[PDB]
Write a protein that binds this ligand. Structure first.
Ligand SMILES: [Ca+2]
Ligand SMILES: [Ca+2]
Ligand SMILES: [Ca+2]
Ligand SMILES: [Ca+2]
Ligand SMILES: [Ca+2]
Ligand SMILES: [Ca+2]
Ligand SMILES: [Ca+2]
Lengths: 50, 82
């Protein structure tokens, strides 16, 4: 008796750590009186984040 | 290059900055330094201009993108310490 299979949904599998293709970024904060002044800021946040 | 299994593997300068264009980050990760990448990011696209020994008067030649920087001693000035 060959009814086939019930496979409407896919059944993925993920990386042990949740995500492994991260990239590095640096925190930036608005400037003041420049309408775009985006300036760096690392007094509290480390300059490299994933 | 920028791939999904390439960068997924730990980047190597011998495995990215050679056969491939050595664009960036794969030009920096393995080097993990802004004091070594910036000096390698100008010796792969436009060549090392210090191979001609341009800075005379025993100056120092530092390689940059499109030009070179000459360090001249006391009493020496000019574009190329001449
Ligand atoms: Ca990376
Ligand atoms: Ca990065
Ligand atoms: Ca790399
Ligand atoms: Ca790499
Ligand atoms: Ca090789
Ligand atoms: Ca590689
Ligand atoms: Ca390969």
């Amino acid at each position: 008796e060959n009814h086939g299979t019930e496979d409407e949904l896919p059944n993925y599998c993920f990386p042990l750590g949740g995500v492994i293709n991260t990239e590095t970024l640096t925190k930036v904060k608005p400037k003041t009186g420049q309408e775009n002044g985006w300036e760096k800021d690392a007094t509290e946040f480390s300059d490299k984040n994933e | 290059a920028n791939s999904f299994l390439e960068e997924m593997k730990k980047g190597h300068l011998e495995r990215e900055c050679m056969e491939e264009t050595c664009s960036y980050e794969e030009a920096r990760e393995v080097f993990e330094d802004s004091d070594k990448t910036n000096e390698f990011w100008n010796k792969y696209k436009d060549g090392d201009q210090c191979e001609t020994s341009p800075c005379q008067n025993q100056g120092k030649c530092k390689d940059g993108l499109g030009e070179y920087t000459c360090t001249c001693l006391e009493g020496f000035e000019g574009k190329n310490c001449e």
